[PDB]
Design an enzyme around this catalytic site. Structure first.
Site, PDB file in Angstrom:
ATOM      1  N   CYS A  20      47.259 166.833  87.472  1.00 12.65           N
ATOM      2  CA  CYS A  20      47.701 167.613  86.007  1.00 12.65           C
ATOM      3  C   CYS A  20      46.029 167.813  85.070  1.00 12.65           C
ATOM      4  O   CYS A  20      45.082 166.312  84.687  1.00 12.65           O
ATOM      5  CB  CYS A  20      47.831 166.536  85.340  1.00 12.65           C
ATOM      6  SG  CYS A  20      48.832 166.927  83.812  1.00 12.65           S
TER       7      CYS A  20
ATOM      8  N   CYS B 271      46.444 165.820  80.955  1.00  9.98           N
ATOM      9  CA  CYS B 271      46.607 164.676  81.532  1.00  9.98           C
ATOM     10  C   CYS B 271      44.793 164.763  82.074  1.00  9.98           C
ATOM     11  O   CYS B 271      43.934 163.086  81.709  1.00  9.98           O
ATOM     12  CB  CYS B 271      46.931 163.787  83.326  1.00  9.98           C
ATOM     13  SG  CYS B 271      48.527 164.610  83.049  1.00  9.98           S
TER      14      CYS B 271
END
Length: 119
Positions: A43, A46
């Protein structure tokens, strides 16, 4: 016999890594509000907020705890808490699911959301 490690090992000393072994003790039973960041290595968004979360965790020591749940390692836990995309942050307070937010944001916005959610 053999000794016990004192930490969770290399990784952030600001946040707590959570899985099924400590979600109850470190999240649901926590005295402080707990923000759980659901993340995964793949991710990219993230990763762009992970340093901000470490900084918030250090600055909010004793006030709000920041936990990390890797969704690839804890997929049922993520599913049971309605996490269907990441980044997602959930706040737990006194064992209750108090708030959520989705998507990356700057530290200032993350911190505002934490403060408002814990109010």
């Amino acid at each position: 016999g053999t000794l016990e490690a004192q930490t969770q090992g290399p990784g952030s000393m600001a946040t707590v890594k959570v899985d099924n072994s400590n979600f109850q003790s470190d999240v649901l039973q926590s005295s402080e509000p707990v923000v759980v960041d659901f993340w995964a290595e793949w991710c990219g968004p993230c990763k762009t907020i992970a340093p901000a979360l470490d900084e918030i965790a250090a600055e909010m020591a004793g006030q709000v705890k920041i936990a990390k749940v890797n969704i690839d390692e804890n997929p049922e836990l993520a599913a049971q808490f309605g996490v269907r995309s990441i980044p997602t942050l959930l706040m737990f307070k006194d064992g209750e699911l108090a708030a959520n937010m989705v998507g990356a944001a700057p530290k200032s916005r993350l911190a505002d959301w934490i403060k408002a959610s814990a109010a």
